[PDB]
Design a protein around this ligand. Sequence first.
Ligand SMILES: *[C@@H]1O[C@H](CO)[C@@H](O[C@@H]2O[C@H](CO)[C@@H](O)[C@H](O[C@@H]3O[C@H](CO)[C@@H](O)[C@H](O)[C@@H]3O)[C@H]2NC(C)=O)[C@H](O)[C@H]1NC(C)=O
Ligand SMILES: [Ca+2]
Lengths: 71, 45
Amino acid sequence: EKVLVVNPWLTQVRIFHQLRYNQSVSNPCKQVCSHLCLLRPGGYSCACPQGSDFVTGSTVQCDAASELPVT
Amino acid sequence: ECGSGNFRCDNGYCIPASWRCDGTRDCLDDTDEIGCPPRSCESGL
Ligand SMILES: *[C@@H]1O[C@H](CO)[C@@H](O[C@@H]2O[C@H](CO)[C@@H](O)[C@H](O[C@@H]3O[C@H](CO)[C@@H](O)[C@H](O)[C@@H]3O)[C@H]2NC(C)=O)[C@H](O)[C@H]1NC(C)=O
Ligand SMILES: [Ca+2]
């Protein structure tokens, strides 16, 4: 079925609806990491910004200075 | 060493013992949750 026709400048179609993503999924991170708290199967994993490493294998604290959030 | 009330990850990281059996694999290892007793439902079910 044809929905609609637009210019060949169209690059992507994306559905903008509440049920497109399960909004009620719980964030597993426990406010441990100093910078990034990425996800992994059944949990999370801390990481440092590019170039900075963990201090003395703390695996939560990096050599990078923390930066204020942008609103 | 880790405190009485703090569980130990075998990597040398001490974490609060509450996180054991909380349902998420908290260590860099999976041994925060490996060895947890499964939830008991009912006898004969
Ligand atoms: C969107 O995600 C939510 C979670 O944020 C889903 O709700 C939960 O889904 C799980 C997995 O299907 C269910 O187990 C949950 O039901 C209850 O879970 C507890 C264990 O935590 C059991 O003891 C209960 O008996 C019961 O089964 C369910 N509820 C919550 C909030 O945990 C939801 O299904 C999902 N919805 C969509 C549209 O994808
Ligand atoms: Ca846990």
